[PDB]
Symmetry: D2
Subunit: 726 residues, 4 copies
């Protein structure tokens, strides 16, 4: 017995806030959270308590501390089969990482539609509001390895595996509504350009290098998703606070055989929020696991990630009614033109048990559709259909990857396929071919029908010659970048300029920077000039006269493209740093902690050391982390209670905590004599918007703080930080 | 519905004789035959009847006859995910075959001890006659690939996986008591020498080529197993009629920790029986699946293969009591010196459902032992311990091969190993290391003990320097070949001479043949002379004067080494061909079948076409096969009843059937006018021992036939067969 | 020295008739034969005479007869890297065999066109009667595994890899002009039917079983190729004496962009010849390697397989 | 075996010895070397036993292990001197 007698090694099996208890496997943290998929995995879940340690062959091990040797200082013997099994398994633990989206964090949950969608699709999962579909979702970055950092500037993946009664449906989306390239044939060129360069394998998790910008400069189709990546969209606060999109026009197919074009949306019910660049970059160093950690802890805390599934629906007859081609994956469909219709709600409510087994081996692929859905001729989507099945053969070791437990359908599956590496299912069918008489032709084909029918493709008319040719309709590259730019707030536009400027400054060959600047001048002159100024580049008279691209169907902005133009803030699940001193005013802390609790906002009590401090009234205050150990990067706001301020007033880390949080536009609240820290961040006596201050933490001090937090960051402070040395 | 109206597509789920029903997966043929392992495989068995045809993702297929194309004569579309999944699975069906023993046939069964062996071993499966242990046994040849022929001349493997309550114990044996080589380091040399030669990959399933005999002539340690292989041991009639041996001295360890040396044996309860060379070779062409079919059909019929497990036990103080080394795996322990103690019975009573999933993916390894057993320093066994774990990494795709259903222990298995390709187990343990506090150190080590204890190696004393050196005590190569030779009957000796003669005639380089004959002269002059005569070689004066090797501890023979010296026949499960005519004397056939049934001997009714014939009393007789379709090679004896003989009397195939059976020493019975056939095999009017003849098939006629069948073959006929052109 | 004094261990490096000499690797048998592809493989050919025996890491081995143990009757030691490297390579020698056509026999050769075909195709290997194209050809059965018998009744494969100056062109044909099925979606159904049945994995190298004929009886499209398989075409005498076919209509495309439909043929210059069934079936027993042996020994004799 | 896909990892260019290497090992996935040796085993007469073992000695000799003395029982036990 090595566990502590007080049982403090084991986390409570109840929802607890971030940092209160060690984290655990989902079935141990939340044993009563169930769904049909989680239940169906019970056959392979393996426990441990009270069991004897064995080899894989079930042989009990007596000494797991020593190899077998001739004499206690002698050579190890080949007949040590316990040593060799154990080391063999270790020696083969690793499998190939995903070619792209290798870095990803995942969770189980469930989806339910708001109402039946039978008028527009025969998809069984969308047929009845009382139909619950288990999901498994993996969020990811794109470029970096499985051991790269979470808060890089990159697109994010948002993949949802729906375990439906009529088969697996994978909705394999991203956090922007378009992609960099038009045709799947170029995907290796694009990916190679953004990935670490091949001579030296640098840089990790970054597009800020020559080959990416070289490619972008020579392939203007990429400019739209580049605008998105350079904006604060490229640096989300949390997977809970970004949008999701299905990237392509697909089809819905109803029982009557009518096709409707659809683009898929996920709206984050926690709101849209992003970091700022300096914060995101520094955070890759201070906690490269920050998003994986935040997702896991939100789920353990009961702050379940929730998203609303939405559809943009376009009738068959309206295929050609836009300025852009619906099948072009570099074009978005503005919500002002085609609204998103609410469809249903997904809640992620349980972490996995074993990350490797459930997360690393999960296979998602957009060809996994079900009756009631179908594809289109989008030439990016068309190639994806090839890639996601082929790649599993090396990644997951062969064609039986659907038998890896997380991948298994909960719907029945029976067919005539046999064998392959790792074959688990033992087929008893006397036949392995059809048609057969020896088993009366079972399992049998099923006609298409309104429910429970076989899959049949929509009979779309095809007419043309066999060509390798880009549609002329796809040859417009600047209008959507422009629409995106004009839709952003002035502070968002500033962060876009700064992303381009920062990234191009890492491009070693100056001609590439110049070429990119030329492309910016084809989108918007103010943008092009601002980036040019940061790069010491002067636009030519010609570049000054490039006429801007047309409006998109008469639109000059669409506010749904902004993260922040329309408020959607939610504070629940956010976190506040509380900077302790050695004699805190206990009435300030009561008021602070209860107000945060009442709104679902977490707190972490920080100090210059671990252990405890004692408040004015003798209350013993447990310390979560030190100032340097849990930097302001990791919180949404900072509160300093009154008390013995002289304890920390000269602590460099405590001052720096506030400068860093100030620079990154976070709300800061100072009570009583904590107002002496005003001088550290240079705040005028009469105060400033975004700094909450009062004699004490009572009255409106906490409501004012929470109002700031609902608006995420203090954008008005941007001109003030510009000269802060932090 | 494609099945016939009369339901004759489905085999009866009751025991039926060979050829009476189509064969079937074991769980459909014998659904109520159970054991703990067969039951535990229920979670992975998949049926088929009344299920819809789907993709692997659970999506119902409407049309499994066509690819999706643009028009019905148009190009196939990349978006056809149904086609690609189905073709992808097909394209990756195959896994590497085993490096050796790739050709093999397997069945489920059980083992039970005759009494408790706790005085000599604490192995839990041997602790009580009530302890029933599920087994899965795979029989094999050695050289040929998985698609090679069964009735080759080769050593056979006999591998038994014991699913004990204290772990998997694999007893991985062969059908002779020794091996060709002494030290594992030479295994690839020997195996490369026997296998098809590397320039052109010829010959398949044969040792009868230059490189094998080149290696043998240069490595006299091989000569002992070579003698076995060249005897009729190399061509068993049936996996049911051959012996098994564990090849090495292992140890038993009892609760007091006392070690006893042991060699393992399996004694076939159906007795020992082999083919003759001409018959075996021809059989590789008429039915290369003969042994696999014969095993499957024996089990379907209720002729369950039964073997008695036997131990040769040698106290530790008797290590040096013999004039050979106990650790030298080219040496056998004569039963005259150390008798075999009969320990328990294994019965094989159920075929697999899916050959690939259960047989091809099964992994046996002699290092899979349990507490109560242990190894010795046998330097061939020592290197085996390395290879059987290492080879599964490519063959079965990674280190989780124990999770493949057939391989899973039925005993509990828990440890801290994680990940690896196609990981099925989802571990919930917070800890993946020990010692740990976070899971109170579970799963925990277990001290060795009398029952349910951890594995601890027997503390054998090791004293010597680190050397690559063969023990001087291994340096004797001819005494055991000689003892084996002298123990054979005169007809077994002739067949050995013929095996060496035939093989060496296929060796193109004549000096190799000469060098092998030189080695034979070191074993026995009469043998060496007989083979030399067949090769047109004359022994030199030196070779005629080589002193024979010494007896083995005073033994000049041991009849346990002979297949046939001690009567051991069992006719149950054997098969007789009955050559029909278009008007059979029904009273002969009634008697014939009645008597065969009372002894559990099967019959096949043969004619010159399929369909039926009609006997003299109007009995309709269904025909199993033509004369050419089911050759005498596939039966143990031939009966020709009376009736219209003129019908078949000039049938070439009918006459040849008897010539072929006669040549191969099989019992032939002729009734009434069937004695007209004595003419074709040149039998004197007064008769011949081994030919049963009478006016009719009365009671004594069948008794004499069944007596001959108990003695397997008519060895006295050998001098008569030289003159027969067959 | 282990070789005999009279050098009779070494096959004569000159054409010799079947059975006259032991067979040998090609580059030792016929070192004067060459073509562009054979020359290009020289960088990976490894000899052997006069070299020391080494690990794969280039370390010379002193004793390749024993494992390293603690005393000459003691246990084998984990530090024996020479033993583990040699046994690890052996343990992993096998790769998956081909799903179909797993049994086959191959040789190097060359191809030359009789005249330029530039009026009907711009394919460079057909543009000049002086242009010689190295080939590597594999002949095969279809159903059985890599260790199954040659003279089974089955379709035969006839695959030619042309190493052209404008890329590899593979002409992947069979010895009949058609196939059993119409649409590739059914290929795993037909292949599963003809292959060994899934419960017991019987029969090897034979369509003579229930599932094959069940499929045929339910899919009359198969009858045409079934007729060919049931004829003596299904049991050829030699890969040298069978026809080859490209199976499908392909297209030739000339320099002007004109498309012409094309079906490909190989005509055996040694003529057409097949066994009879009783002989072919017994021969699978007496010599399951007869066609592989026959091909190899024909080339060693200078009876080179020729095809138009 | 998993990381580099088989036992021919020494043939991956970076891994290849510059010193000669010849032996009787054959096949494995993505086998690069084409062996011409009539023999793939030793001892052989058909290639006069090449490539051959080499005795140990001062330079260019075969590898032989130092003959360290081993005395002890087969134990899974940590040396007391390590404690
Ligand atoms: C719409 C969102 C989106 C788009 C447009 C693309 N990816 Fe993704 N991707 C793979 C290939 C692939 C291709 C061929 C294309 C355009 C032709 C895209 N991508 C663009 C992949 C290599 O097959 C992939 C890697 C491993 C795998 O299983 O499939 C793959 C990953 C991926 C993910 C991660 C899913 C997960 O396992 O967590 C996501 C969210 C996307 N892609 C989105 C996506
Ligand atoms: C005595 C019974 C016996 C002996 C002495 C040996 N074999 Fe076997 N063999 C493998 C390697 C190996 C070595 C290294 C040695 C002596 C050093 C022996 N053999 C001699 C193997 C390559 O590891 C093997 C191939 C596939 C596999 O999983 O292990 C292997 C197979 C094998 C079988 C087949 C078991 C089965 O899969 O059905 C049998 C019965 C033997 N060996 C017997 C055996
Ligand atoms: C026309 C000659 C012919 C035809 C019509 C087909 N095969 Fe072959 N085959 C493979 C798959 C395949 C499919 C999907 C179809 C129709 C849908 C055919 N076959 C019909 C394969 C599984 O991809 C295959 C196995 C290994 C491989 O590399 O490809 C394959 C083999 C094969 C060969 C063997 C070439 C060789 O290595 O000697 C030949 C001659 C054919 N097929 C001919 C063929
Ligand atoms: S996309
Ligand atoms: S053995
Ligand atoms: S074909």
């Amino acid at each position: 017995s090595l566990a502590p007698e007080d049982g403090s090694h084991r986390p409570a099996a109840e929802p607890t806030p971030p940092g209160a208890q060690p984290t655990a496997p989902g079935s141990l943290k939340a044993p009563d959270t169930r769904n049909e998929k989680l239940n169906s995995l019970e056959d392979v879940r393996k426990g441990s308590e009270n069991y004897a340690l064995t080899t894989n062959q079930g042989v009990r091990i007596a000494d797991d501390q020593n190899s077998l040797r001739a004499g206690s200082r002698g050579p190890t013997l080949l007949e040590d089969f316990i040593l060799r099994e154990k080391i063999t398994h270790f020696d083969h633990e690793r499998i190939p990482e995903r070619i792209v989206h290798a870095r990803g964090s995942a969770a189980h949950g469930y989806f339910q539609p708001y109402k039946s969608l039978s008028d527009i699709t025969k998809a069984d999962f969308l047929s009845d509001p009382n139909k619950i579909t288990p999901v498994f979702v993996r969020f990811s970055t794109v470029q970096g390895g499985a051991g790269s950092a979470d808060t890089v500037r990159d697109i994010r993946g948002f993949a949802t595996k729906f375990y439906t009664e009529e088969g697996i449906f994978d909705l394999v989306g991203n956090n922007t509504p378009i992609f960099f390239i038009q045709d799947a044939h170029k995907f290796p060129d694009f990916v190679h350009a953004v990935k670490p360069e091949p001579h030296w394998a640098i840089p990790q998790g970054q597009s800020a290098h020559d080959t990416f910008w070289d490619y972008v400069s020579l392939q203007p189709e990429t400019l739209h998703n580049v605008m998105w990546a350079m904006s604060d969209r490229g640096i989300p606060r949390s997977y809970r606070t970004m949008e999701g999109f299905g990237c392509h026009t697909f089809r819905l197919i109803n029982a009557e055989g009518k096709a409707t074009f659809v683009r898929f949306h996920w709206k984050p019910l926690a709101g849209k929020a992003s970091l700022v660049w300096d914060e995101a970059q520094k955070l890759t160093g201070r906690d490269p696991d920050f998003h994986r950690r935040e997702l896991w802890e939100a789920i353990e805390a009961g702050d379940f990630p929730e998203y609303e599934l939405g559809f943009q629906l376009i009738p068959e007859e309206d295929e050609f009614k836009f300025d852009f081609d619906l099948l072009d994956p570099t074009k978005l469909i503005p919500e002002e033109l085609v609204p998103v219709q609410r469809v249903g709600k997904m809640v992620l409510n349980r972490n996995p048990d074993n990350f490797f087994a459930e997360n690393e081996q999960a296979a998602f692929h957009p060809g996994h559709i079900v009756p009631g859905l179908d594809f289109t001729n989008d030439p990016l989507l068309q190639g994806r259909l090839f890639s996601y099945t082929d790649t599993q053969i090396s990644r997951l070791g062969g064609p039986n990857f659907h038998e890896i437990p997380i991948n298994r359908p909960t719907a029945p599956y029976h067919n005539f396929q046999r064998d392959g590496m790792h074959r688990m299912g033992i087929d008893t069918n006397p036949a392995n071919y059809e048609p057969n008489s020896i088993n009366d032709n079972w399992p049998r084909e099923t006609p298409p029908g309104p429910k429970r029918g076989g899959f049949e493709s929509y009979q779309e008319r095809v007419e043309g010659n066999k060509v390798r040719e880009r549609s002329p309709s796809f040859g417009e590259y600047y209008s959507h970048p422009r629409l995106f730019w004009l839709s952003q707030t002035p502070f968002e536009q500033r962060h876009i300029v700064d992303g381009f400027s920062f990234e191009l400054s890492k491009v070693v060959r100056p001609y590439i920077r110049e070429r990119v600047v030329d492309q910016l001048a084809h989108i918007d002159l103010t943008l092009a000039q601002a980036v040019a100024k940061n790069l010491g580049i002067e636009l030519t008279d010609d570049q000054l006269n490039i006429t801007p691209p047309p409006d998109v169907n008469g639109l000059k902005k669409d506010p749904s493209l902004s993260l922040y133009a329309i408020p959607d803030g939610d504070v629940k699940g956010r976190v506040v740093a509380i900077l302790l001193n050695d004699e805190v005013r206990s009435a300030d802390l009561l008021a602070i902690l209860k107000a945060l609790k009442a709104k679902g906002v977490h707190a972490k009590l920080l100090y210059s050391r671990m252990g405890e401090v004692t408040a004015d009234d003798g209350t013993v205050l447990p310390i979560a982390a030190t100032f340097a150990g849990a930097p302001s990067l990791t919180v949404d706001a900072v509160i300093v209670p009154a008390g013995n301020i002289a304890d920390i007033a000269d602590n460099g880390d405590a001052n720096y905590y506030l400068m860093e949080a100030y620079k990154h536009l976070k709300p800061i609240a100072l009570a009583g004599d904590a107002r002496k820290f005003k001088a550290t961040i240079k705040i005028a006596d009469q105060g400033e918007e975004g700094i909450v201050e009062a004699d004490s933490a009572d009255g409106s001090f906490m409501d004012e703080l929470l109002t700031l937090m609902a608006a995420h960051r203090v954008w008005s402070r941007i001109p003030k930080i510009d000269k802060i040395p932090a």
